[PDB]
Amino acid sequence: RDLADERSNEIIRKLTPEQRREALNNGTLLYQDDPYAMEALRVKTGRNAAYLVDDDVMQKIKEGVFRTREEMEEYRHSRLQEGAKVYAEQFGIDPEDVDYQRGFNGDITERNISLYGAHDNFLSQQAQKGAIMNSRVELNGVLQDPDMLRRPDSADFFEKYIDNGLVTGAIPSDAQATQLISQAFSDASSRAGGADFLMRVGDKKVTLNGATTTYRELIGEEQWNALMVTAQRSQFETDAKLNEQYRLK
Amino acid sequence: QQAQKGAIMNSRVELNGVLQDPDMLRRPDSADFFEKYIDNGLVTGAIPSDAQATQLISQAFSDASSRAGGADFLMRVGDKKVTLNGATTTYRELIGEEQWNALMVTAQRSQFETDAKLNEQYRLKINSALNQEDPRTAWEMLQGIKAELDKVQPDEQMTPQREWLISAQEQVQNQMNAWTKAQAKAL
Amino acid sequence: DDSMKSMNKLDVIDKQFQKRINGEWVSTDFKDMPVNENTGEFKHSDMVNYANKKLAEIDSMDIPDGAKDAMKLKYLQADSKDGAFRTAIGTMVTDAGQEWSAAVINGKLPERTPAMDALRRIRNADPQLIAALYPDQAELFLTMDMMDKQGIDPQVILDADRLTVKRSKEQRFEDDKAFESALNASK
């Protein structure tokens, strides 16, 4: 049947593109009997087959599901074949033709670049979340103790920890470093140990994107005053609370 | 009929995938692509009916004139030659001249509306930071917004986004002072 | 053009209402609104427009919902009592009351209770002012207090309202006389 269609196509190819076109708008020419138009149709359909179902679904699964690259590869191979077949059978094309397969692989390499880079981005995000929550756990365990805040080495610990996170690669991005530092300062100012800890971390230096400066200057001077006032209030409030429990006993 | 339905679906998908993205509309390659794509579709045999080609052209122009970057695309594509019928004309002539003015005005309005909405979103973020219960949290959010700007636009300064951000920083300093007063009063 | 002019004059009204909140007792009459020659002529529609867009913005902020309710009260404190914030919040109150009356008529409470939820939030912010500016819906405010503050089942209240739909005219006069006696005998 393809050979009969091919000899018909050789008959029609003897027509110039404009007379072919005007035959196409008339009933004189059937669309499936136009070889150039039908090859274009199969190429476009195969390209849409590879792109649309397989890869948009792949990207959706990727953003949330795919643990490792190897899982992605096999899922992608399976869906590629199945989607090729089903998208072809929905259309008139049968998924065994040269043009359809050529379209299905039309931009395989740039699709691969996008997909693999997106999975790499996913792994990067996962690692960053892991590191940031580990840093949150460590600093919370330290600064959330009024006892640990009162050690004369808590401030030196805090400066050294932030410096180590910056240099080693933890606390990724200076922006999240600022978020961690500010949240740590608020926690300390609320935890009955923030007075001494803040007086001791005030002169300590931290190296952000802009430059190296003391924590007092990284934080707003007005914000530093607010932190100290609220830390003194926390000191007084906790003292009064424990005093009240003893008086109640 | 099945083959023509498939061809029209393919052409529609490719074309509106290109022209519903303002980022792709804004490149000069968009207008070059549209001209060459209509041409190839005519010559290959895709876009089977000159009638369906005019339908596709009109709907593509309507889609572009609804996006942010559509007006630029229309300026570029207005002087592109095309051959639907026997005669050859530019897209400005194929489309009505009054219809071209309508497309241009609606594209300009779409661009203005999109830019205004983006500014609304950005200032919404700024004010949402500014209205925090704890001003220290406001400072944290403002530093995050500063990080986003420093990613997208590090080199320039005194852009409206930057001016709004600086004003927000100053307002959060005032909140710092008031919060200090409140906490001392509570003590 | 109207989008540009509205975008400019809603900002003017926002500055004026910010001054109003901060204590600078200023007018809310559109004729007293300043015109910068990019603003326009301050048609009365832009005031209700500003109130609606402001309420949507407050609902759209990233702040805690309690602060949203607090700012809704702040923007409703500060109107001319003809103001569009009063009209909008009263519309909210009447829509919640209509929803309750529809529930009574239907014999069952609807799902998702949107107006009821919105008024519940804005009233748990401050019951006293909401009751003061909208005394007419005193029964509705009492119903909400019964349902959420107290543990009373909405179905029981709903059935009670459905059964007590006989005003009887004379029953109303007897209610008046009994109520006046109950007061002058209360001590």
């Binding site: 609320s190 | 500014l130 209205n131 004003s167 | 910010q18 702040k74």
Partner: peptide
């Protein structure tokens, strides 16, 4: 709980 709540203070609406 060691954490001490900060004072709730009256707030004025601010716009950039």
């Amino acid at each position: 709980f060691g954490g001490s709540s900060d004072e709730t203070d009256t707030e004025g609406t601010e716009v950039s």
